[PDB]
Ligand binder design. Structure first.
Ligand SMILES: OC[C@@H](Cc1ccccn1)Nc1ncnc2[nH]ccc12
Ligand SMILES: [Cl-]
Length: 167
């Protein structure tokens, strides 16, 4: 039993809700919140920009030190950093950004990072400003993640479409 509330159950381990991941994380304070990161951990917009804003830019400061030490992530890769005031940890995961021409096949590799954590609050990878089809992202999530994932979809219209079209 966990403290996530109001989710629709899609499979044994995947749940979905219309919610602002920022407000969800603040309410639940999960062990792991997933960020929709880019390889430079520049949290300018989308989910990343919103999560960073909620940390008063502390996420960006920590991320800049991470990059200065380690260099950029790989597309499909991840790193674990602090969750600041939002969660214990933030798993920064880089899905492919279609608006950069990146290979959509890497979306499965991106979701594989979730399997290293027993429970996660997450957005749909490569959705929104990363330009992938959210219906496809949900399918890859369900077919790749085996740990317990609580998906937050900010857009109510998109949420209803994701639920109604789910196979
Ligand atoms: O896929 C992730 C995208 C989905 C999206 C957003 C808007 C319009 C269309 N798609 N973004 C988010 N998801 C959950 N919480 C969020 N908080 C801020 C941004 C955000
Ligand atoms: Cl977005």
């Amino acid at each position: 039993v966990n403290s996530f509330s109001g989710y629709l159950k899609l499979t044994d381990n995947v749940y979905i809700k219309n919610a602002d991941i920022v407000e969800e994380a603040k309410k639940v304070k999960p062990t792991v919140v997933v960020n929709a990161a880019n390889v430079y951990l520049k949290h300018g917009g989308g989910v990343a920009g919103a999560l960073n804003k909620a940390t008063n830019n502390a996420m960006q400061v920590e991320s800049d030190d991470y990059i200065a030490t380690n260099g950029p992530l790989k597309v499909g890769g991840s790193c674990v950093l602090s969750g600041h005031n939002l969660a214990k940890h933030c798993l920064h995961v880089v899905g492919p950004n279609v608006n950069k021409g990146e290979d959509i096949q890497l979306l499965k590799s991106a979701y594989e990072n979730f399997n290293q954590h027993e429970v996660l609050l997450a957005p749909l990878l490569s959705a929104g400003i990363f330009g992938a089809d959210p219906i496809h992202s949900l399918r890859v999530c369900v077919d790749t993640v085996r740990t317990n994932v609580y998906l937050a979809v900010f857009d109510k219209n998109l949420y209803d479409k994701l639920v109604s079209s789910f196979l």
